[PDB]
Copies of this chain bind each other. A is one copy, B any other.
Amino acid sequence: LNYEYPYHPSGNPKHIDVSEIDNLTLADYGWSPDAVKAYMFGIVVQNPDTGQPMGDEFYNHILERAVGKAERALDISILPDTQHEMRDYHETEFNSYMFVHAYRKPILQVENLQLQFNGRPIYKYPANWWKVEHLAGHVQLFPTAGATFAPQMIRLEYVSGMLPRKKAGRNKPWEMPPELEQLVIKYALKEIYQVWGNLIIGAGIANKTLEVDGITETIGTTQSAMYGGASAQILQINEDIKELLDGLRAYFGYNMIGL
């Protein structure tokens, strides 16, 4: 075997280059204004004072915040980032093959793992000892060869995040599931419908009739004193979000810790 040093092919296979984490963008995961507009096919949002359509700056803003919402509704790291953690010694888990659970998951790869004292490395574990479980967020060592805890004894550096899926309809444990993309889209779309619901009719109108010289024109709109113009669409989007979240909260597990 030959490999780039930390990335032992069995225990810590390389999944991404540290150059690519700066090159990946939201558009590479398919989150783009065009996708939102596709879900709003046959609708256009434009300023009634000017006819100007809504700018892609707003779409990208909403998309980035929707990504943040998805990254907090589930205890996951969606976008690749380098994580540096200082973790505590605990006797039970240290005896349990040096078990540590990362704060962020999935793990793309582990970059460094050391035992240290006042920042001095006391030991540097050989990379061939590192065992990584990517979707779980678990790291262990399997060596080839006065108190129960102490603070910040373990120094851990790793890359968290998810890669874009390589094939249609499929994902590896380190690849974003196809439906989490749709969840983020639904979160963005739920905001866009709230914007659009103000512009179907003049402000604050639920009904109008206008008649001139016996020509009569009359409208009942979807607005009402209770429900906004986009009420039904938002309700449906919330149902879809509920189904998607149930599915994804089955894919990622329940959080647990041993006291």
Query: Which chain B residue shows the least CB distance to A97?
Result: B151
Contact (Cβ within 8 A) A43 B198: yes
Contact (Cβ within 8 A) B225 A226: yes
For A209, list chain B residues within 8 Å (CB). 216-218
Distance in angstroms from A225 CB to nearest chain B CB is 4
Interface mask (A143-171 → B, CB under 8 Å = 1, otherwise 0) = 01001001110010000000000011111
For A179, list chain B residues within 8 Å (CB). 65, 68-69, 72
Contact of A69 among B151, B198, B225, B243 (CB under 8 A): B243
Interface mask (A197-235 → B, CB under 8 Å = 1, otherwise 0) = 011110111111111111111111111111111011110
Contact of A169 among B68, B73, B97, B231 (CB under 8 A): B68
Contact (Cβ within 8 A) A42 B199: yes
**Is the CB of A58 closer than 8 A to any CB of chain B?**
yes
For A225, list chain B residues within 8 Å (CB). 221-224, 226-227, 231
A237 to B212, CA, bound (A): 39
- Residues of A104-129 contacting chain B, CB below 8 A: 116-119, 128-129
Contact (Cβ within 8 A) B219 A222: no
Contact (Cβ within 8 A) B214 A212: yes
Contact (Cβ within 8 A) A218 B222: no
The verdict on A210 contacting B203 (CB below 8 Å), with A119-B11, A169-B68 known, is: no
For A207, list chain B residues within 8 Å (CB). 218-220
Distance in angstroms from A32 CB to nearest chain B CB is 12
Contact (Cβ within 8 A) B204 A229: yes
Contact (Cβ within 8 A) A169 B232: no
- Residues of A182-204 contacting chain B, CB below 8 A: 182, 191, 194-195, 198-201, 203-204
The verdict on A205 contacting B178 (CB below 8 Å), with A211-B215, A227-B225 known, is: no
Name, among A97, A212, A221, the residue most crowded by chain B CB atoms within 10 Å (CB to CB): A221
Q: Which 7 A-B pairs have the closest CB atoms?
A: A200-B204, A68-B178, A207-B220, A228-B232, A72-B247, A10-B119, A224-B225
